[PDB]
Write a protein that binds this DNA or RNA. Structure first.
Lengths: 96, 20, 155
RNA sequence: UGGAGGACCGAACCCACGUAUGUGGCAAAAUACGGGGAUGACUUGUGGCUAGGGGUGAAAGGCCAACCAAGAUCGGAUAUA
RNA sequence: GGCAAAAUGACCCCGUAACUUCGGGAGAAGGGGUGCUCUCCUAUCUUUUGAUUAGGAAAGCGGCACAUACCAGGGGGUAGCGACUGUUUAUUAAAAACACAGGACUCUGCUAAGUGGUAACACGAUGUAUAGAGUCUGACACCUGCCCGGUGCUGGAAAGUC
């Protein structure tokens, strides 16, 4: 991968442990490397099926993330499902 | 599986210009 | 046919299976187990909305049946095993260096002071304490035991 | 063949270890000669944030406008002694 | 107190110990060579005409001296502390102080714990126990004995005491 998928990139700035009032709240963090945020569909869809298109290294949530080209619902590619373990390219069903 | 369909869309104008 | 990566409500899910990415409220969104390769496990299905689940914290809860899950454990099991090997790795992840207690002058942390290393007393000294007088060892909870015991004794 | 290193030697750079100078000095903290790192926990420009019992601190009671075990300036207040 | 001062330094070649985490020690230590002249061959070079510039052969030639000036590591043996690169008392202390990856304990089921505020609320985090917070120690190897009587922290029984 060179970039993420343009539909799902979003750059929320860091916050080195400062609340809405710019004082120090959670100590010992800040100073790392500029991240982005990959908008994940964390609430499953209406009944459909999809094909795992890839698996991408993800900075925020340790696990890897898999854009799924969807065959139903007209989604035509959602950002992903938190990576299921076994299948690295297979077919899914969010609800029967 | 393309991640960037580009076009006759150009880049780095005010970087090139500065180099020149 | 219980196939990996699929989702569904727990109502169409069978006992003994393994799951992750559960959601607490009906469709709120998966906030339960999500980390690299950590697997909850159902324990039964009484048709009262609830379903008893064993979480990685060892303890267990009850989630409404209309809630959802994802079959199989989350990906990437090694991340909990990869041991970094210098300081730059922490720095890159985002951390900054953490200073201990017995280092600070007493004005700054309840463990300070001393002409050489020392923290507290042989009679007086309470325990090892956070920057705010709260103790951290022994099983301390600070009157959130109320919430814990309420939500438990809902069993 | 490859080109990794909180890799190595060394200028930019930063930093400030030793000696000598200076001690109404060139300077209310420098100079000479040597020193350490020098692709990284790097250095820097720009602009924004955190404000006094508070901030900030790889933690020395350090720093916050040249003098911090609680800034500066007004005021109570011609405090008290 | 060898502080300072001195000295070593470069490139090429020869050779190089203990130890070991088998990556290193290691530029280990210890030596030699370094100028120019012509010739020969080698390469190479199109900057055309065949020579020029560099390398390496081998014969001279001069000087006390041929990295001649400037530039440029002193090295070895062995304890203590610290594993190391780092950071700190601007402006008298840069270290054995601090950090540091590595380890353990305790807390948190998500409106997560914890934090700032009165409070909304914000951080935690568009994170979910392989996660986050606090605490002590500080790579590695070998290991980590006894005591819960005291201080704390904590589970709990009916009694009384409220």
């Amino acid at each position: 991968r060179a970039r993420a998928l343009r539909q799902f990139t979003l750059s929320t700035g860091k916050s080195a442990g400062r609340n809405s009032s710019g004082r120090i709240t959670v100590f010992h963090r800040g100073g790392g490397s500029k991240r982005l945020l990959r908008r994940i569909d964390l609430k499953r869809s209406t009944s459909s099926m999809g094909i795992v298109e890839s698996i991408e290294y993800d900075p925020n949530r340790s696990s890897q993330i898999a854009p799924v080209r969807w065959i139903k619902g007209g989604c035509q590619k959602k950002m992903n499902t938190i990576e299921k373990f076994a299948p690295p390219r297979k077919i899914l069903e969010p609800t029967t | 599986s393309s991640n960037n369909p580009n076009e006759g869309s150009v880049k780095r104008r005010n970087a090139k210009k500065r180099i020149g | 046919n219980s196939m990996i990566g699929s989702s569904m409500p727990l109502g169409m899910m069978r006992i003994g299976t393994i799951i992750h990415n559960i959601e607490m409220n009906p469709g709120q969104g998966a906030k339960m187990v999500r980390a690299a390769g950590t697997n909850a496990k159902i324990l039964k299905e009484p048709a009262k909305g609830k379903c008893l689940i064993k979480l990685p914290s060892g303890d267990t809860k009850w989630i409404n049946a209309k809630c959802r899950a994802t079959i199989g454990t989350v990906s990437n099991p090694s991340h909990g095993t990869k041991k970094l090997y210098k300081a730059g790795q922490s720095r890159w992840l985002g951390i900054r260096p953490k200073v201990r207690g017995v280092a600070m002058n007493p004005c700054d942390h309840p463990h300070g002071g001393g002409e050489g290393k020392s923290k507290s007393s042989g009679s007086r000294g309470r325990t090892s304490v956070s920057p705010w007088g709260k103790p951290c060892k022994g099983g301390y909870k600070s009157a959130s035991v109320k919430k814990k015991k309420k939500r438990l004794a809902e069993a």
